[PDB]
Structure formats: C-alpha cells, structure tokens
Amino acid sequence: ATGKAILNGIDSINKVLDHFRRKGINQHVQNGYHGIVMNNFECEPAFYTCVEVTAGNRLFYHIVDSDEVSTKILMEFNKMNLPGEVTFLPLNKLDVRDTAYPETNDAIPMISKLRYNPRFDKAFKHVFGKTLICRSMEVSTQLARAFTMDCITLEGDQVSHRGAL
C-alpha cells in the first residue's frame, strides 16, 4: 500500500542520521530531525481510518526544525546516491495559518482528535488543519459547501471543499 520510493526514503534518511550520529557531526541536524508524521501523534483507534484517508502520503512526511536541516539531510542523501523520495515539513517555514472552525453538533475538527506535542503544531495544522470529521456523508456535503472545508466521515467517505467526491 505504501510506495517503495517513500519507504526507501525513510531508510536512506535513517542511514544519513545514523552516520551523523556515529561520526559526532551535524548535531543541529540530529536535534532538528523529528521523524515522520505517523510517529509523532496518537489518536483513538476509531479515528484511524479517517485520519489515514485524510493524510495519505503525508503520514510519511519528515518533520524537521528548519529548511537548513532539510537541505543538510538532502546534501548527504544525494552524496551517497541513496534511493527514495523524501518530503520535509520544516517547522520554521510552514506558512499555514489558523482556521476558524464552525460551531456544530454534526462535526469535529480532526486536529482536535490528534494527540501531538505543541512544538509540531505547524506540521499538524498543515496536514490536518482544514478537515472536519462528520457524523454522516449527508452532513459532510452540507458542511463543506457552507464552510469551505474538506469533510470526512469515520468510515472514510469524503466531501471536498470545492465539491468533489
């Protein structure tokens, strides 16, 4: 289910960081590397399906302190001709803004169900900040076209903010 180029990227990055660790170099990269999105939150298992459907491959984006940490990882990644595709969420550059969620009995902001440390807040607002978890697919369509926001049900059915299913 998960693409091999992503899995290769995870392993190649694990290689780069271990090399930095064993050689006692690039401490700021080591400090600044936080792992993939999937390993930095928990939620209740009832929400597993709609969280994985909303995140898609961004579950395997790498959370990092900064763009400098990203490009230092990539400079050694590419020096070693390592396999994979990697995508970084650099906390000091993510320009995501806070979202006004609607008052409703029918829906919940998905980010309100994710347990993560607030230092990763810009990363999780980027991935999940614009998504409502709704009771039904009936109510997702009305909520998406009333407050222009992606909607999704607990069983995985989605309604887009533009109006696509």
Binding site: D67, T71, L74, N78, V86, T87, L89, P90, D95
Partner: protein, 176 residues
C-alpha cells in the same frame, strides 16, 4: 504495446490527440533534465488532447482494447494563469518553462499548467534563498531535483529523479 495504442488514437483523432507530454517537449540542456522531471511530475506521462470529450473518447478506446489506463490533459479549458514575466529579472534563477522547448505552439498552455512560475536555480542554496529569502515566496527547484514549495514543504532525492530523467534521452529515436 502502449506505444502503438498511442499511435492508434493519434490516427483516430487527427489534430485532436497531440501525444504524451514527454514526446512533445524537451529540456533545452541536459543539466536541466532532473529539475524538469521533478517539476513536471506525473504530467510528463500525460496525454495532451484538445478537449475533454476526446479525452473520454480515448478513455473508451483503451477500455476496449484491454490496455492499461492513461491520464489525459484536455487543453481547451485548462485552469491556467499566465507566466510571470517579471521573474526573468531575478538573479540566480530562470523560469522552468523558459528551459523547455515544445513541439507545436499549442502545447505551451500544457507547460504553463505544469510549471506555472516555478524557477530553476543552479544549486540548492540559491533555490532556498529565492524561495524563502524574500518577502514574496517562490516555488524553486535546484538542479539535483530538490524542490521548495511556497507552503514551505521541501522534497528531493536525486538518484530516483536521475533514473527517470534518463527517459528524456531514451525516447529519442531508436536508430534501429
């Protein structure tokens, strides 16, 4: 086999199916192959067509011949913004579209869709400084395929992008 299913729909709708985008354009130099590969993405395998009906018409054709599905970029009503002219004065960067040559002039709208105002720089530190160092953000790509989005997302991996940038030279005519 997909080569002549492709040649068959071109002769079935002449003037209407222009072809796969990789066949319709070429990066001007070899140094730009990985960056163009990265920016174009899955659009380099897109079949450019005139209209969305003929796209569905070719969907129905491949559906009839057991062949594997393809993706179609209908040109006529492509959501596309015009290329930002002022970015050519940016030191260190040229436009990604300004670095592709394309076979008919209609195809320029497909590249405008796929590239937009993405910029190519010669090294990562240049791409990082143009993307994020100014007051306005820019989408930039370095020659090793490291891409900086306006949202702040960064992506890369040069050996996986080199392995599919060689596709630019292999589809050039089989001499035999």
């Amino acid at each position: 086999r997909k080569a002549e299913i492709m040649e068959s729909i071109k002769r079935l709708y002449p003037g209407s199916v222009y072809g796969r985008l990789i066949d319709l354009c070429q990066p001007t130099q070899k140094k730009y192959q990985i960056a163009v590969t990265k920016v174009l993405g899955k659009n380099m395998d897109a079949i450019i067509v005139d209209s969305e009906k003929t796209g569905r018409d070719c969907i129905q054709y491949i559906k009839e011949q057991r062949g594997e599905p393809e993706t179609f970029l209908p040109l006529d009503y492509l959501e596309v913004k015009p290329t930002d002219e002022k970015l050519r004065e940016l030191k260190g960067a040229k436009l990604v579209i300004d670095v592709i040559r394309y076979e008919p002039p209609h195809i320029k709208k497909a590249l405008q869709y796929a590239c937009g105002n993405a910029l190519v720089c010669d090294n990562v530190e240049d791409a990082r400084r143009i993307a994020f160092g100014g007051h306005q953000r820019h989408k930039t790509v370095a020659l090793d395929g490291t891409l900086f989005q306006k949202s702040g997302v960064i992506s890369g991996g040069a050996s996986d992008l080199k392995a599919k940038a060689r596709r630019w030279d292999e589809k050039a005519v089989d001499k035999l």
